[PDB]
Ligand binder design. Sequence first.
Ligand SMILES: Nc1nc2c(ncn2[C@@H]2O[C@H](COP(=O)(O)OP(=O)(O)O)[C@@H](OP(=O)(O)OP(=O)(O)O)[C@H]2O)c(=O)[nH]1
Ligand SMILES: [Sr+2]
Ligand SMILES: [Sr+2]
Ligand SMILES: [Sr+2]
Ligand SMILES: [Zn+2]
Ligand SMILES: [Zn+2]
Lengths: 1342, 49, 48, 90, 99
Amino acid sequence: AQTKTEEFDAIKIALASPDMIRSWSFGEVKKPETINYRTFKPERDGLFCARIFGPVKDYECLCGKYKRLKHRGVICEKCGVEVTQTKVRRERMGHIELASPTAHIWFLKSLPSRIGLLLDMPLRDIERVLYFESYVVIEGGMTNLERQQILTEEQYLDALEEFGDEFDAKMGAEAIQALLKSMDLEQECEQLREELNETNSETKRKKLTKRIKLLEAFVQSGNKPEWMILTVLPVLPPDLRPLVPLDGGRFATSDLNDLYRRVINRNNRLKRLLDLAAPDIIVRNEKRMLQEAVDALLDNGRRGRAITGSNKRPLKSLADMIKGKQGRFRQNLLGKRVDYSGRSVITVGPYLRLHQCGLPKKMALELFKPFIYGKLELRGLATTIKAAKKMVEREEAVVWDILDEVIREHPVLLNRAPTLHRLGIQAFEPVLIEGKAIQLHPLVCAAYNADFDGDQMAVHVPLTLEAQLEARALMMSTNNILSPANGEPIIVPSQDVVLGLYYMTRDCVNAKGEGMVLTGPKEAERLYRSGLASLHARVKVRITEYEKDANGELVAKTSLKDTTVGRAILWMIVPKGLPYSIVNQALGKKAISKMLNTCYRILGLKPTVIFADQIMYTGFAYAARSGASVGIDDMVIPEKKHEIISEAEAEVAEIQEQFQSGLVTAGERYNKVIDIWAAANDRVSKAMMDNLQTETVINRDGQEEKQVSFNSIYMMADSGARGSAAQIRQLAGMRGLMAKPDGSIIETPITANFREGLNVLQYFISTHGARKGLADTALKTANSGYLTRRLVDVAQDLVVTEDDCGTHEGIMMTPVIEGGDVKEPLRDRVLGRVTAEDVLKPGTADILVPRNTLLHEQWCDLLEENSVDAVKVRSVVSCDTDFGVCAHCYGRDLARGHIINKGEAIGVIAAQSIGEPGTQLESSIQVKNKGSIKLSNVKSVVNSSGKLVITSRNTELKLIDEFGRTKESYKVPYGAVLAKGDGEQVAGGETVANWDPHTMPVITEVSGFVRFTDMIDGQTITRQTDELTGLSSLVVLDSAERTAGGKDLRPALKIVDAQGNDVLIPGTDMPAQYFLPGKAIVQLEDGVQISSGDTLARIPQGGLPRVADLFEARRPKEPAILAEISGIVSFGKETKGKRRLVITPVDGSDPYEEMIPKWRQLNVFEGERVERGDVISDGPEAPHDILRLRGVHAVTRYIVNEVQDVYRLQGVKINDKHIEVIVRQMLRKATIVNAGSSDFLEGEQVEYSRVKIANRELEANGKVGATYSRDLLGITKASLATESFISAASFQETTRVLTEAAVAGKRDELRGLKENVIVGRLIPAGTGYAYHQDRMRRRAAG
Amino acid sequence: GQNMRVAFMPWNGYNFEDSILVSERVVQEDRFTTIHIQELACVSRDTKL
Amino acid sequence: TDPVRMYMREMGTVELLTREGEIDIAKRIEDGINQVQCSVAEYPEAIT
Amino acid sequence: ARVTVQDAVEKIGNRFDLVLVAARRARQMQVGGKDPLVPEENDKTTVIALREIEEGLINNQILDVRERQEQQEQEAAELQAVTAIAEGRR
Amino acid sequence: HARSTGSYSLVTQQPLGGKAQFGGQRFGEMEVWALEAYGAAYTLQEMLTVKSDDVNGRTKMYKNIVDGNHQMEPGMPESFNVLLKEIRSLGINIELEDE
Ligand SMILES: Nc1nc2c(ncn2[C@@H]2O[C@H](COP(=O)(O)OP(=O)(O)O)[C@@H](OP(=O)(O)OP(=O)(O)O)[C@H]2O)c(=O)[nH]1
Ligand SMILES: [Sr+2]
Ligand SMILES: [Sr+2]
Ligand SMILES: [Sr+2]
Ligand SMILES: [Zn+2]
Ligand SMILES: [Zn+2]
C-alpha cells in the first residue's frame, strides 16, 4: 500500500481531538511575543518562531553559523532551528495549552446549537452556567434534582448540606464538558424510540426527530461529545498572518495576530492566578474573558464585537477568512488571477477569416515570451536563456520571424466581460498585425454582446497539447457556428453585410442593361464593373444549379432563370450543393439567416463556414459600391402630418365640453381622450409608410409607379440591417406618448418628430423615459446575472452518464395555439427530440415510423404532409439514470449536427441558454369552420336587455359538421353570454360565446325589485370606480377594513315584488337573499327592477420577475382550488359565505375534509361527481397543487409553457429541453409514505429511493416496498440539499455547512463539477469525464 | 478636439459597428496629436542593511 | 458588551469594610502566618 | 485540420475522446521521436496529429497495439539483464 | 496590457502587477461556466493551478515550454492549501483520504 503518495480521492471533515491538535503542532506558543525592535527576527517562543515553525531565510539558521544549501534537515544545538526552506513557515502549525476549558463558538452560538440539541437544553440555560451565574446538575440519584437542573449559589448551598458526597454539580464550562462526559450515546437513542410509540404528535414531532438525526449521525462517525469544549487551541502558520516590512518602512500585520495576543495574555495570567491565591470572583472573570478571547479569534461577529488595537474596525477572524463575499473559499472561482493573459480594445477585421483574429504584435511577443525562448535555442540562433532574453528586449529583426512560426497553428482564446453564455470565450488562430489594438471578426461579434466603440476583451493563451486541442476541437468559432440555446445559427451577417446583399438582390423598373441572354454568371460581372449594366433590372441569366441526389451527388439541372444581374454574381458565392431558389429572392436578415441554416444540414460543417466568410467579403464590397447615406432629405415627413394632428387636437377639446356638462364623467374622460391620440399616432405612422415605403413614381419604361423605394432609411429597415420600423416612427412621423413618474401616460403626446425642432416642454417630457429606461438597464444586468447564477448552482452537478435509458416514456408535445393562432408548429417543437413511441397516425400508406431515433431536419418534413398531432417524446424529466441524463432519451445537441455525446455537462448549458437572452426581457370563442352549435347541460335564461346568460357551473361547447362528427372542444365558465342555442347553423368567422375575462359575475334566479338590507353606507360598503362596465359602483369590503361601529352586518341583496314582499326562490319557501362576499363590486342601485338573468355583483380575481417566480415555485396570492379524491363528493355545513368540502369515495376508511375561504366562486353546485384534479376557482394555479394531484407530468409542462410565454412576447427562441433539465433538478428529493429503513419524513432523492426500492424488493433483507411521493423544490430550496460540503460552502453560508459536516462526519468523494474546481482537479465533464471513469471503477476492487 | 471631413458611407468592413476610418493626412498633419506629461519618482531609502 | 456588566454585579454584592473592620481581617492574617511559623519551628528537620 | 475538425470527429465519435487520442499522438511526436504518418507540410504538432485521424492512420486502438509492441521490444532487448538480476536476489 | 510571467502576491500566490510587467487578467466564475459548458477540462486546469496559485506547478510547467514539452503536471493549488490550514486552526479536523 502507498503511504507517501499525496494522490487523494476523498476529503472528510470531523471534530478535532486535543491529542490530534498536538499532532498538527510542532511546538507550544507560550509567549505573546512577535519580533524584536532592534533586529527584525522572531523571538523565543512567540507567534513568530524559527524553533517551532521554521527559519525566516532559505536554508539558514538565526545566528548565521550554518550557511549554504549543504546542510539539510539539521536541528541546531545553539538555536534549535531546522535548516530547511522558508516555505515550512506556511505549512507548520502550533498549539496553545488552555489552563481552563473554553467552549467553541461555532457549536454554541450557531443555530440551532449543536451542544444544545445534543443535551436537550436551551441556550439560555447553557450560557448562564458557562458565563458563571448558576450551577448545573450532572450526576443524579436520590437528590430530587435529577439532571440538567439550574441552581443558584444560594440554592446549591442548601442542597449540598441536605445530601452532598454522592451529589455532583459543577460551575462553568468545566460543568458542560463533564455533562458531555457522563452522557451515554448508546442508551439515549433507545429511550427516544420507545416514547415515540403511543404519543406521536405532528408539529412537536419534528424536534424529536431532529434529536435522533443528530445522535445517530454522531455515533456512526465517532466524533465524541467531549471535544466540543476546546482544551488545546491550534495556531495558524506565520506566513498566512505575516509581519512584513513595506516600501516605506512601517510594518504591516494581520488582524489575526492582534487577536492571538489577546488569547495568550490572559492564558498566562490564569496560569499565574491559580497558584498565586485564587479568589473565585477574579478567577471566574479571567475564565470569562478567555472564553471570549477564543470566541473573538474564531468568529468575531457573534458574541460582542472586538475592536483592533490601532484601527477602528472589526478584526478579520478565522471565520472571516473563509466567508465575507471575498475570502478564501469564494476567491477560488471569482477572484482568480491568471498568467499568460492580455487585454486590449477591440477593432474590426474584415480581411480576416472566421478562425482568424488580429492579435497585436507587441502583445503577442509579450504573451508567448517563454515560447520564443523555447524555439530560439532550438533553432541555434541563441546560445542560452539569458542570450535569448537580450534578443527579445532589443526587438531584433530575426525574433519577429520566429514569433510568427510559434503563433501559427497555435489557438488563442478570446474572452469578453460579461460572459452570459458559453460563446463568450472562443478560440482563434492569431494573425500578427502592427498596432496596440486587437482585431475581431465581424461575424462572431454577434455571439458576444460587443460593439466596436470602447469594448475590451481578455486574451488567454493555452499551454499544453490537451489545452490546444480542446480549443480547436471544441472552443473554436468554426466549430461553434450554431447557438447552444436554439437550432438557429448564431453567426449571422448583420448591418453592413445585410445592406450589401439587399442592394445586390433588389430590382429596379428599368436600369442599365435589360433583356439580355447572358452566358453564365461570369458575364454578369463583366457588365457591372466595366460600366455597361447595373446590378438591378430583370435580366435573363444562364445558370447551372446542382440539386441533392438520393445518394449524392449526380444531379446537374441547367435552365434559364429570370433574375437580375446582381443575383447572378452572388450565385458564384453560393456553393454547388444548394438550390438556386434561395438566392432568387431579395435577401434580408431574415433571408440570409435561412441560407446558412439550410447549408448546414444539406452539406455539412466545413462547406458552410467557407460560405459564411464569402458572404461577408462580398457583403462589404457591394455595400461600399452602393454608397448608402443618411441625409436630412431622406427623413421624409408624411404629406398631411399636421392635418391629421389638427383633427385630433381639438377633438380633445370636444370631450372637454362633455367634462363640464356631465355627458362623459371626469374618470371616463382620461381613458377616452388617450384613445384619440393613440389612433392618431398610428394614422401618421401608416401615412409615413407611403412616402417612404414605395415612393418612386418616376418610371421611364411605361407609365407605372409600383416599385420598392430606393430611400436610404427604408433600405436599413426593410432588410433588417439596423433600425426597426419603431425607430423610423419617431424620426420622420411622430414620437408618440410618454410616461409620468407615477406610471400613468401624459394627456398630450409629443407631436414634433426628430426631423423638426422639439419644444422645451416636449424635450423635458421625453427625458423621463430616458432616465427611467436606462436606470432599469443599469440593474437589468445585475438581476438577470443573479438569475443566471441561480440556475447554475442547482443544475451544475449534472452530466450524461449512460448512452440510453431503458424507459419508453416521455412528454406529450402539441403545437402551441393561443385562441385561434399557431405560435410554433410541430416541426420546430419536435426538432431534435427523440420519440418514445412509433407514429401511428393514418393518412398516407406506409409501414410505420421507427422509434428511438433522431428526428433530422429532413425527417421532420415527412411528418408535415401527414399532419401529426400529440407525439410523446423522450425528455429530461422521465429519466431513471442513476445520477444524470441518458443521452438518447434526451435529444440533439443544438450547437452540433447530431446527438449529444456523453460526458458533456447539460445543466450548465441549460442555465446559460436562459440567462443569456434574459437581458432582452381565449376570452371569446371564435370558430372558422362551418357547422352547428350543440350544447349540453344548458341552464340559460333570457334577461330584459337580451343576453342569453347561462346559470350553470360547467358548460362545454361542441360543433357538428356536414357528416355528423365533433370538430372542436372549448370550455365555457360561469357568467357567459351565448350567441346561439341548441342546433343552430354558423357562418365562417363568427363568435358564439362571449364573457368578460377578468371577473366572476353573480347571477340571480328570481325577478323583481332590489332591496339593500343591512347595506349601510360607510360602515360596510364604500364607493369608488369599477374598471370593466364601468362607471361609479359600490365596493364591498372584507371583514378586516370595516369600522368598529358596524361589526355584525351581512352584505346581502334582497329581492322583492311590486308590493314589497319577498319573491320566493323556486324550490324552498325561504326568502330571496343573495349573500355577497368580500371584494365584490355591486353595479345595481336601490329601487331598480331586474329580470331573471341580471348580474347582481361581480367578484374580482410581469417579465423577468415572472420567470424567476415560476422557477422558484412560489405560490400565488390567490391559489386555485382542486379536487383531491375521485368519487361522489358533497358539501357539508355552512358559516356565512363559505363551504366545507367533504370528500368521501366508496371504499374503506377514507376520512377527508376541507376548508374553503368565503369570497371564492366555485365550479360545482350540489351533489357532483368530481375527479382528481379539477378546476373549482378560475385563475392562476399553484405549482405544488398540480404535482400533488395531476401528477409529475402536467406540472412539468406547466413550467415549460408559462416560462416560454414570457420569452415568446419579447421575441426570444429557447428550446423546451433546456427548461426541463432544471425541472428535473426541482423534482428531486421526495417524501416517503411507507415504512422502509429510516423514519417517515426525512429527505431522500427520487433516484436514491429508486435504488432503494430495487434493492429492498428482491434482496438486501428488507422485503418492504417504500412508497414515495414526489416533492417540488424551487432552485434555492433544492440547492441547499447537496450531498457535498465543499460544494455547499461555495455559495451557501459557510459556518453552518462546516459545523454540520463536522458533527455528522461527512465525506466528499468529489463527483460534482464545482467540487473539483475548488480543490484544483479535473472536471468530471467533457475531456476529464473519460479520465474520471478510470478512478471510479477501481473503488469496488482493491 | 477639432473637426474633420465626414462622409456617411459604408466601407469594406472598416466601419462595421460604430467604427470610424481616418486618412493618413490626419496623421501627417498634426490635428489629433496629444501631449502627455508623465511624472516618475525615484526614492532612495534607509534600510536595516 | 456582556463581560463588562456582570463583573460589576459580582463584586456589587460584597460591601466595603472600613476602619476597624479592616483590622479584624488583618489580625487573622498575621496570626495565620505566625501559626505556620510555629509549626516550622517545632519541626526538627527545619533546624537541620 | 486547421479550420474544421469534423472530418476527424466522425472517425472516432466523441469530441472529447478526440482530444485525448490526438494528445497521446502529439506528445509522442513532441518528445519520444515518432515519425509523422501524414506528410508534414509545416504545421504544429497539434494539427499533424489530427491529419492522421482524417486519413485513418491513427486511433485509440492503433495507439494501444503499437504501444504493446514497443514495450515488448524493449522487454526482449533487456531480458538479458533482468534474468541476471533475479539470480542474485534469491 | 500583456503578461506571461511576473510577480506574485504574498498572502495568495496568484499573479500581481506593480513594476516591469502588467498585472494578469482575472478569470471569474462566469468564465468558469463557459468552460464547464464546453468539453474543456485541461484549460480550466491551467487557469486554476499553473496560471494561478500552484507554486510547484507554475515553475515546472514554465521549464517545459522552453524544453518543448507542453505538459502540465499539476498539484495542490495555494488557494486550497491555505484553506486547509484555516479550517485546522479553527479546531475542526480536515484530512485528505486516499483510494
Ligand atoms: N479564406 C478561407 N480559407 C479557408 C476557409 N476554410 C478553409 N480554408 C483554407 O483551406 C485550407 C485547408 O483547410 P482544411 O480544413 O484542412 O481542409 P481539408 O481538411 O479538406 O484539407 C487551409 O489552408 P492553409 O491554412 O494554407 O493550410 P494548408 O493548406 O497549409 O494545410 C485554409 O486556409 C475559409 O473559410 N476561408
Ligand atoms: Sr451589439
Ligand atoms: Sr458598450
Ligand atoms: Sr521531427
Ligand atoms: Zn543558529
Ligand atoms: Zn432518460
